Amino acid sequence: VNSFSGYLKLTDNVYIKNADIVEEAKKVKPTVVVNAANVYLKHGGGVAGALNKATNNAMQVESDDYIATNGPLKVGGSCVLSGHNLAKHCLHVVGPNVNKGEDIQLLKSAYENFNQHEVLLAPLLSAGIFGADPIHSLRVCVDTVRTNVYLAVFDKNLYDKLVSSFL
């Protein structure tokens, strides 16, 4: 038993809710919140901008130190950093950005990072400003992640379409 509430169960291990991941994180304090990161951990907009703003920019400060030490992530890769006031940990995961021409097949590799964590609160990778089809992203999620994932979908209209079209 865990503290996530109001989720629709899609599969044995994947759940989905129309929610703001920031507000969801501040209420649940999950062990892991996933950020839709880029390779530079520059949290300017989308989910990343929103999560970082909710940390009063502490996420960005920590991220800049991480990059200064380690260099950029790989597309499809991840790193674990602090969750600040939102979660114990933040798993920063880089899905391919279609608006940068990155290969969509890397989306499966991105979701594989979730399997290193038993339970996660997450957005749909490569959705929103990353330019992928959220229905495809949901399919890859279900077909790749084996651990327990709670997907927060900000847009109610999109949440309805994702549910209604789910196979």
**85 token code pair:** 């006031």
**H helices of the chain, where?**
21-28, 46-54, 58-70, 106-112, 134-144, 156-164
Site for ligand S7O in 99-158 (CB under 6 A): 123-124, 127-128, 153-155, 158
- Asked if residue 160 binds ligand S7O (CB under 6 A), the reply is no
Q: Calculate the CA dihedral of residues 159, 95, 25, 6 and round it to 10 degrees.
A: 30
Q: Write the DSSP symbol of residue 124.
A: P
Site for ligand S7O in 12-41 (CB under 6 A): 20-21, 36
Q: Return d(Cα 108, Cα 144) in angstroms, integer.
A: 7
Strand partners, 92: 35, 79
Which residue, 54 or 68, has its beta carbon nearer to ligand S7O?
54
Stretch that binds ligand S7O, among 44-52, 62-70, 110-118, 140-148 (CB under 6 A): 44-52
- Asked if residue 50 binds ligand S7O (CB under 6 A), the reply is yes
Which residue, 1 or 125, has its beta carbon nearer to ligand S7O?
125
Q: Return d(Cα 138, Cα 136) in angstroms, integer.
A: 5
- Asked if residue 91 binds ligand S7O (CB under 6 A), the reply is no
Which residue, 35 or 63, has its beta carbon nearer to ligand S7O?
35
Which residue, 93 or 124, has its beta carbon nearer to ligand S7O?
124
Taking the complex as a whole, the smallest distance from the CB of residue 60 to ligand S7O amounts, in Å, to: 15
The residue behind tokens 């380690």 is 70
Taking the complex as a whole, the smallest distance from the CB of residue 93 to ligand S7O amounts, in Å, to: 11
Q: Return d(Cα 153, Cα 9) in angstroms, integer.
A: 14
Q: Which residues bind ligand S7O (CB under 6 A)?
A: 20-21, 36, 46-47, 50, 123-124, 127-128, 153-155, 158
